[PDB]
């Protein structure tokens, strides 16, 4: 009984952990791309502000 | 006369603003009184923006600037072979003038669509990983890309070294003249490089075009095009050339300096809107010519440095997009012991099989597939206690094929030696060999087949493929050798 | 009138005129050059001076050099004579086959069809390709985002599309190579010759080619889409056709506009794109549509920067797309051709109010079963296929047959394969998949449904397999 | 020729001349000042006006004040008279010991040696620093760079190198303080008087000092590296000798350039830097070199702004080096000093044909186990240790022992460690990491390997720890 | 003025983030083109020239000094950012504080691994050096091992000891506000911990123990404390006396 | 016109994301300083002045009303972005539609937890 319960539970736990990680990946990927876009724009605004001030 | 001569209005930061020169053409080479050259990049209503080929100290307000009937061309021909020159083709190796009998403009249009034919002929690097899984054909543009210090220059150097086996041979079709363009590197680095090629006896068929870190920006800007024209001499006269641009990140930085200082508008990462155009016109000049045009070719291996693996930064984006494929190198692979540090999952050659000999095509296809199957399961290796027999095998085969893609520096391989090594792996012979021993097995195995089995290697090369006979020979060499190895 | 070059700064040329100025978008012809140098007017700077963008390299230009105003935007040859021919952005032949002897020329800049000229109907453009027509069908006058790249039968699909639209709808095709790689443009051309969609010997060419190659200046790569589009518009407007326009690829159209915008000194917008990102795309895309006289339907290869679907470039493009065709390497390695991902491909007109309740219920039934089959695949790898309920056994059987009946032999591949190509009517596609779902062919073997056209051929293949 | 000041904004002064315009790079001398104020010509603006960068403060300057063209670039004293002296950017003594009585002077601006002047010889220079010697060794006459963000250990490392290599060096050394702490300059000076490599009483001094620190305006900081370099060039060429050049910190040359750049009228490049960053660095860096005439072993501390190695300034520097020692805040934070990233440090001589196959093999084995551990960390930090195979967890224990045996008490760092300084011979380094990898110390605890010299000290420490 | 006249001063710049913002404003309005983060290109120099002026003078210049504690406010805990690293790249060390530490009860909220002194034990009395000399590296290794040991399963004798010491030292470096401690009292307290006499005391009791221990030595052993303060060190005699006090007192405390 | 003449009108702005993109093009071409996501500083005001005009008038002003339904397009559900937050900070609540719900066939794909009406309750019939 012990092993049937344990292996069922590990399967469920790991399935849950796998799906959680999966959700965390998505979320971090969106965060990544929001930051990536911000970085490119910020850098560009610094250049233009520096240039226009001349 | 302000039609044929001008007067420096202002000078600083490698830009001379010149009054007059009413009749200058755009991009014309002009000359300052001191003898320094400059190129006319900005033609404006009241001034010419002239980019300075040297030190500003020698140009002062009011200096006379002349048109001379100058044309931005370079020496071209076999007389450049074995020589180290600067961006304008001047000898910098201290071995006297180039004996050049012909010249060619650095700025010329790439062959159009019609004069070309499909890329077909192998351009053999001698590097197992490349020739098998990222194969390059004559006329292709294949990018070498990765962070600093990941092995990029070495890919190119080993490719140049490899050609000796053909250039020494008797088949003129298979011969390949090499051009290494150094942009923005330090002089002693270039010096180590040519010493390497000299020692390898590769210099005799190599031209080194070098515009190093203290050369002025316009010179670094021209150097790739200069080397490119020297390569086109071979392309256009029924011969084959390979050019390495090491590297294009540095060339683009040099051009950005000029563009920003001319006050041309800045865009992403402060590059101008023509930096894509900069690289695209250079890389389209690599071509495979049809028979009516002599059947020659120019293959290009541009180099790009990424920053922290950012393949989506501006200049890598441009050059990835322009090229026919990419060989991606990675730091973590390097320190893991995967050297060459080629990411075999990401690396691509869109020319692909069309650029491979039958023998390689066979085993490389099997290896590609088994490495992909391995990659799917790879993360379950060091966390796999109770895996089924099937998945246990995919890992076993994967780790062994991966070990066989490792290669020492400065020792490029004949294609038949490559296939014989890959055979041992794809046919399962090493599946029970402890992975740490593979590189040792290969080195000894290869030494043995080269020594005792030249005839076998001959047949793998000649027959195009691996016959029933070659297959029976290898089976018996490998199994007997292996049992001796593990004895 | 005749003007004089007053400034040259890379691909930006300023020209002064003494009398009337060429309006914005006009084509100017630079005098005293070996080959045609066209400048397009971008701005009126004041003081009788226009700022232009060059359509070729500007090396060798002198201040005071003569420039002729053509009196119009770039005008290019249009008509049947363009079919099988390759032109550039300014309408010159680049295939070395002599002049393009059309009787009409047309300006590459035109306003989009007016509101009154719009079709208020939405109809499928039947492609004859089972996956596409059933699961993610093309809207007549719509835009389709094609995903994939290399090694997934992209060119073959493009060539089959050209073949099928000509066969089924009498409509010709235009291929616009935006940032075309010279090597690949050459190969595409001969592939089109070998497939027969282009014919050098007669007048049966189905496609006109327009190439804006990578080594050309930003202005040229920015405008080629328009040149291609203009060629297509002749077939819609003058010949009442349902036309196909391929744009390969749209990201390079956006990027060329970003480069031109930079050259003109315009402040870049978010992520570095042109501030005019949305209007550059809009003034182009809106020309592709169904009018009362006919349609242009556009298949557009999409490159997604940094794999970021929220990047301004794909986000701007996606506003215009009515469908996606996703070509997948995984699908190709299963031997499914065309390598279209049946779950990843989508269509906005997959709606009962547009394609009908029957088409909708069958498509949705195919999607569901395929989704369901994916859910069972983990259980197969664990418990085995003989441990499934009699309902689940049946969904695997049917799903797999459906997976195979979604494949289809192409006419354009008759050379390389030897098998006859199939163009399948929509009602037969619908019927075929309707019957597999209903369980009418549970008795037939799985492989009978592989590389077949209509459902009868799967019955005939089942019989032939002894 | 006499000129007049027409504009002053910060470090940037505009000067009009009625007759002969001074060429770019010329030193101009400002009249009516208490201490010498030099302006260096940067650009000819047109209309007989030159734009200059000042070498000292511009406070007190007045529009109309007279300026004399000297007729040449900044020229400084070079030769044996510089030994044991401190000089500033413009070659004035700043040690309060009177005139520098050289027979000759040299311009701080010079052409870089030609390609044909290059040497390709490269032999190991042993440091006694385990992590450097094992994984990324220095070469005699080579270009060495020490990269690090703020406060990771660049300067402590350069001082340990000065301590280990320069104290017993047979030739001359130059130390260029560039945009760094004045305190550190006074420390070094009195330390070198104490060791006798500087001698204030006789002629036995082996080191010349050149300083222009972060109390100085950008002009001084953008040129003081050249002053230091020009001194070393003399020793290299006009004695053909073995020269050591230490520069702390070469970033400050690039940064100084960025401070004046907008006032020089440049559109900025990316990350606020001058468009000329790379060519400026190139013309300077290519003079810092061994030639056929003589050898310079150059060691340069390289600051990494915001800890970002992709920052244009350090990123552009890498290509100029033959060995790179990259320091990491993440490693320092663990108390692992020196804070060398063993997976981001390189050397041109790290090659089995140069260092031999045993040294090469051990180094790569060390790097391999550390990368293997690195890829396991974040994975086992969530899924647990007990899920590892009994050979996978053996790479963990060995790697964590190897991380610590890479740490080392520095002699110069006693005020920070409380430990006595250790120097470890090359062969002992090899043997030690070779033995750990082989499993010879699986029984000893992690901490036994932390902050010691040779392997035997890890064995002895393990005993101390037992009780 | 004190620095040059034989006296010693301490200056606090609270804060330099706000000063750099005012400089930015002033520079922009002067039409000086913006650089990184819109600050002028020479925002490092703004602060470098200021802080270089804190200095220790030699006896010939009067032997006076000026010590500086500049203050910088970071955003979202990022000490690695541009402006913060600029100022770190000037000073002879930094004390880095974090909210996380603060709310967990580490107050003062000092991150040990990320903080440094660039003068070290040269700036300490011999007595403090005697008790604190190796503690900073030791605490860095402790925090690393405590993170690695997180999944509590079989730990060897060495790391368990490292852990027990570390967790207790952390309690000893906790301190309230407005009662700064005399050096000899700091030494007595740190002594009890680094010498291991507290290794078996429940970590939650350490703070209660310190305050009771301190009040005891202050009242009862003013002579021992006097000698340490005056001698600037822990002599063999002082050491013997301290050991006897902490061992016996702790035992009383634990009754 | 209806609002002020004792009648009731409903206006849909489909959509305000595209209008802000158009105003950004105008601003950048005018060389106005770019800010967050390269938008000008008056991009909030662009929308606020427009949405303030939707109003309920009292009987002394004819009792008419103008109801506004502005539309905003999010990128991958990011409600925290500049333009989405600007408009949330203007309107009297939001109806949020989720890609996840829509894909699952829950249509209208309203995320109930994320939707509000700040003022609509008093205008709901008792029967409802
Ligand atoms: N196959 C290999 N096996 C072992 N070592 C190699 C191999 N290839 C390259 N290396 C070494 O790895 C280091 C980096 O090689 P290199 O070709 O300089 O890469 P890179 O990216 O061009 N470096 P850089 O240009 O300085 O950023 C050198 O020390 C090489 O000797
Ligand atoms: N090898 C080392 N051993 C012990 N502590 C060190 C070591 N290197 C650096 N530190 C600590 O880090 C501080 C900063 O080191 P420093 O060399 O001044 O950094 P950088 O010059 O890179 O800014 C030192 O004052 C010291 O406290
Ligand atoms: Mg390299
Ligand atoms: Mg330092």
mmCIF file with all atom_site columns, C-alpha atoms in Angstrom, chain F residues 12-79:
data_model
loop_
_atom_site.group_PDB
_atom_site.id
_atom_site.type_symbol
_atom_site.label_atom_id
_atom_site.label_alt_id
_atom_site.label_comp_id
_atom_site.label_asym_id
_atom_site.label_entity_id
_atom_site.label_seq_id
_atom_site.pdbx_PDB_ins_code
_atom_site.Cartn_x
_atom_site.Cartn_y
_atom_site.Cartn_z
_atom_site.occupancy
_atom_site.B_iso_or_equiv
_atom_site.pdbx_formal_charge
_atom_site.auth_seq_id
_atom_site.auth_comp_id
_atom_site.auth_asym_id
_atom_site.auth_atom_id
_atom_site.pdbx_PDB_model_num
ATOM 1  C CA . UNK F 1 12 ? -17.081 53.616 -28.422 1.00 0.00 ? 12 UNK F CA 1
ATOM 2  C CA . UNK F 1 13 ? -13.454 54.511 -29.009 1.00 0.00 ? 13 UNK F CA 1
ATOM 3  C CA . UNK F 1 14 ? -12.125 51.539 -30.920 1.00 0.00 ? 14 UNK F CA 1
ATOM 4  C CA . UNK F 1 15 ? -9.411  51.811 -29.971 1.00 0.00 ? 15 UNK F CA 1
ATOM 5  C CA . UNK F 1 16 ? -7.410  54.255 -27.820 1.00 0.00 ? 16 UNK F CA 1
ATOM 6  C CA . UNK F 1 17 ? -4.146  52.268 -28.065 1.00 0.00 ? 17 UNK F CA 1
ATOM 7  C CA . UNK F 1 18 ? -4.056  52.961 -31.792 1.00 0.00 ? 18 UNK F CA 1
ATOM 8  C CA . UNK F 1 19 ? -4.892  56.634 -31.165 1.00 0.00 ? 19 UNK F CA 1
ATOM 9  C CA . UNK F 1 20 ? -1.970  56.983 -28.736 1.00 0.00 ? 20 UNK F CA 1
ATOM 10 C CA . UNK F 1 21 ? 0.371   55.302 -31.272 1.00 0.00 ? 21 UNK F CA 1
ATOM 11 C CA . UNK F 1 22 ? -0.790  57.943 -33.841 1.00 0.00 ? 22 UNK F CA 1
ATOM 12 C CA . UNK F 1 23 ? -0.222  60.776 -31.344 1.00 0.00 ? 23 UNK F CA 1
ATOM 13 C CA . UNK F 1 24 ? 3.231   59.371 -30.534 1.00 0.00 ? 24 UNK F CA 1
ATOM 14 C CA . UNK F 1 25 ? 4.086   59.478 -34.279 1.00 0.00 ? 25 UNK F CA 1
ATOM 15 C CA . UNK F 1 26 ? 2.973   63.134 -34.365 1.00 0.00 ? 26 UNK F CA 1
ATOM 16 C CA . UNK F 1 27 ? 4.928   64.011 -31.232 1.00 0.00 ? 27 UNK F CA 1
ATOM 17 C CA . UNK F 1 28 ? 8.188   62.356 -32.244 1.00 0.00 ? 28 UNK F CA 1
ATOM 18 C CA . UNK F 1 29 ? 7.937   63.961 -35.675 1.00 0.00 ? 29 UNK F CA 1
ATOM 19 C CA . UNK F 1 30 ? 7.464   67.278 -33.818 1.00 0.00 ? 30 UNK F CA 1
ATOM 20 C CA . UNK F 1 31 ? 10.636  66.317 -31.861 1.00 0.00 ? 31 UNK F CA 1
ATOM 21 C CA . UNK F 1 32 ? 8.863   66.377 -28.515 1.00 0.00 ? 32 UNK F CA 1
ATOM 22 C CA . UNK F 1 33 ? 10.951  64.612 -25.826 1.00 0.00 ? 33 UNK F CA 1
ATOM 23 C CA . UNK F 1 34 ? 10.151  60.872 -25.668 1.00 0.00 ? 34 UNK F CA 1
ATOM 24 C CA . UNK F 1 35 ? 9.364   59.323 -22.289 1.00 0.00 ? 35 UNK F CA 1
ATOM 25 C CA . UNK F 1 36 ? 8.177   55.957 -21.005 1.00 0.00 ? 36 UNK F CA 1
ATOM 26 C CA . UNK F 1 37 ? 7.718   53.634 -24.058 1.00 0.00 ? 37 UNK F CA 1
ATOM 27 C CA . UNK F 1 38 ? 8.722   56.691 -26.141 1.00 0.00 ? 38 UNK F CA 1
ATOM 28 C CA . UNK F 1 39 ? 5.338   58.346 -25.463 1.00 0.00 ? 39 UNK F CA 1
ATOM 29 C CA . UNK F 1 40 ? 5.132   62.087 -24.826 1.00 0.00 ? 40 UNK F CA 1
ATOM 30 C CA . UNK F 1 41 ? 4.319   63.370 -21.327 1.00 0.00 ? 41 UNK F CA 1
ATOM 31 C CA . UNK F 1 42 ? 0.895   64.605 -22.466 1.00 0.00 ? 42 UNK F CA 1
ATOM 32 C CA . UNK F 1 43 ? -0.259  61.156 -23.595 1.00 0.00 ? 43 UNK F CA 1
ATOM 33 C CA . UNK F 1 44 ? -2.340  60.755 -20.375 1.00 0.00 ? 44 UNK F CA 1
ATOM 34 C CA . UNK F 1 45 ? -3.927  64.178 -20.981 1.00 0.00 ? 45 UNK F CA 1
ATOM 35 C CA . UNK F 1 46 ? -4.649  63.092 -24.582 1.00 0.00 ? 46 UNK F CA 1
ATOM 36 C CA . UNK F 1 47 ? -7.073  60.517 -23.121 1.00 0.00 ? 47 UNK F CA 1
ATOM 37 C CA . UNK F 1 48 ? -8.205  62.215 -19.899 1.00 0.00 ? 48 UNK F CA 1
ATOM 38 C CA . UNK F 1 49 ? -9.653  65.296 -21.564 1.00 0.00 ? 49 UNK F CA 1
ATOM 39 C CA . UNK F 1 50 ? -11.534 63.078 -24.002 1.00 0.00 ? 50 UNK F CA 1
ATOM 40 C CA . UNK F 1 51 ? -12.997 60.725 -21.401 1.00 0.00 ? 51 UNK F CA 1
ATOM 41 C CA . UNK F 1 52 ? -13.946 63.534 -18.987 1.00 0.00 ? 52 UNK F CA 1
ATOM 42 C CA . UNK F 1 53 ? -16.545 64.584 -21.583 1.00 0.00 ? 53 UNK F CA 1
ATOM 43 C CA . UNK F 1 54 ? -18.638 61.456 -21.116 1.00 0.00 ? 54 UNK F CA 1
ATOM 44 C CA . UNK F 1 55 ? -20.900 62.622 -18.262 1.00 0.00 ? 55 UNK F CA 1
ATOM 45 C CA . UNK F 1 56 ? -24.287 62.372 -16.623 1.00 0.00 ? 56 UNK F CA 1
ATOM 46 C CA . UNK F 1 57 ? -26.039 65.776 -16.545 1.00 0.00 ? 57 UNK F CA 1
ATOM 47 C CA . UNK F 1 58 ? -28.484 66.733 -13.799 1.00 0.00 ? 58 UNK F CA 1
ATOM 48 C CA . UNK F 1 59 ? -32.088 67.775 -14.622 1.00 0.00 ? 59 UNK F CA 1
ATOM 49 C CA . UNK F 1 60 ? -31.106 71.493 -14.543 1.00 0.00 ? 60 UNK F CA 1
ATOM 50 C CA . UNK F 1 61 ? -28.889 70.777 -17.541 1.00 0.00 ? 61 UNK F CA 1
ATOM 51 C CA . UNK F 1 62 ? -31.523 68.726 -19.404 1.00 0.00 ? 62 UNK F CA 1
ATOM 52 C CA . UNK F 1 63 ? -30.776 65.346 -17.761 1.00 0.00 ? 63 UNK F CA 1
ATOM 53 C CA . UNK F 1 64 ? -28.876 63.969 -20.774 1.00 0.00 ? 64 UNK F CA 1
ATOM 54 C CA . UNK F 1 65 ? -25.798 61.767 -20.740 1.00 0.00 ? 65 UNK F CA 1
ATOM 55 C CA . UNK F 1 66 ? -22.828 60.551 -22.723 1.00 0.00 ? 66 UNK F CA 1
ATOM 56 C CA . UNK F 1 67 ? -21.498 57.063 -21.938 1.00 0.00 ? 67 UNK F CA 1
ATOM 57 C CA . UNK F 1 68 ? -18.018 56.126 -23.167 1.00 0.00 ? 68 UNK F CA 1
ATOM 58 C CA . UNK F 1 69 ? -16.624 52.670 -23.883 1.00 0.00 ? 69 UNK F CA 1
ATOM 59 C CA . UNK F 1 70 ? -12.929 53.189 -24.643 1.00 0.00 ? 70 UNK F CA 1
ATOM 60 C CA . UNK F 1 71 ? -11.019 50.174 -25.902 1.00 0.00 ? 71 UNK F CA 1
ATOM 61 C CA . UNK F 1 72 ? -7.379  49.419 -24.920 1.00 0.00 ? 72 UNK F CA 1
ATOM 62 C CA . UNK F 1 73 ? -5.248  46.570 -26.287 1.00 0.00 ? 73 UNK F CA 1
ATOM 63 C CA . UNK F 1 74 ? -2.862  44.912 -23.859 1.00 0.00 ? 74 UNK F CA 1
ATOM 64 C CA . UNK F 1 75 ? 0.306   43.081 -24.832 1.00 0.00 ? 75 UNK F CA 1
ATOM 65 C CA . UNK F 1 76 ? 0.267   39.578 -23.308 1.00 0.00 ? 76 UNK F CA 1
ATOM 66 C CA . UNK F 1 77 ? -2.059  40.575 -20.450 1.00 0.00 ? 77 UNK F CA 1
ATOM 67 C CA . UNK F 1 78 ? 0.168   43.345 -19.102 1.00 0.00 ? 78 UNK F CA 1
ATOM 68 C CA . UNK F 1 79 ? -2.235  45.736 -17.375 1.00 0.00 ? 79 UNK F CA 1
#
